[PDB]
Amino acid sequence: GAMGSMERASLIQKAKLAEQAERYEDMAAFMKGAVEKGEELSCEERNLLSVAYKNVVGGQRAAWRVLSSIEQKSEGPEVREYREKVETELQGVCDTVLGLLDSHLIKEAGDAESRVFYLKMKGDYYRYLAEVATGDDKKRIIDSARSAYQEAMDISKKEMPPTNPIRLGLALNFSVFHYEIANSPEEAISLAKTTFDEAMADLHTLSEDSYKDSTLIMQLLRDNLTLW
């Protein structure tokens, strides 16, 4: 890639500059370069990575949904063609992120928090692929997302308390996957409910700030339970 000749520290510096300038494609490219140096990321760095790509893929997903909406309200081939163009670009970005996670962020993650963080990302970006996938491809992608999320769940249950915000956010996104993608509403509801109850059990032990952190995400679980 184009970032191979730049120092790791310089890439991180420029990623932060890009963020200040709201240049998220640049930010993502700089963080990809940093990851490809082969060293583990700090907590601050993997959050830079996640922010950058979430912004890029978020813009693409929003555009895809605008075009898909126009397409479905549709007499020419142009809306479909342009929707497919945006789709292909979105798929490219997700493939890039998944490639970073597989080579080799997940296997080199040195603690439970980072492992869960990366496995959750893997589930998320397979989920974004699933949103625009169709046939047998979609079924393979769905199984890949589920397996990544489930591995993250297994680690989080063994290594994190039930009120931990990363664990809660993982359960939130996995339950969304069940409902929106895998057409498994019962699994979605069961997961959100169990997560909610097990967090509630420990709220009384938390500091004020941690109580706030945990109940915030519990309310996101609750919003979805109400909707479902």
Partner: peptide, 6 residues
């Protein structure tokens, strides 16, 4: 359905 922000 909304996933974790942002």
């Amino acid at each position: 359905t909304p996933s974790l922000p942002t």
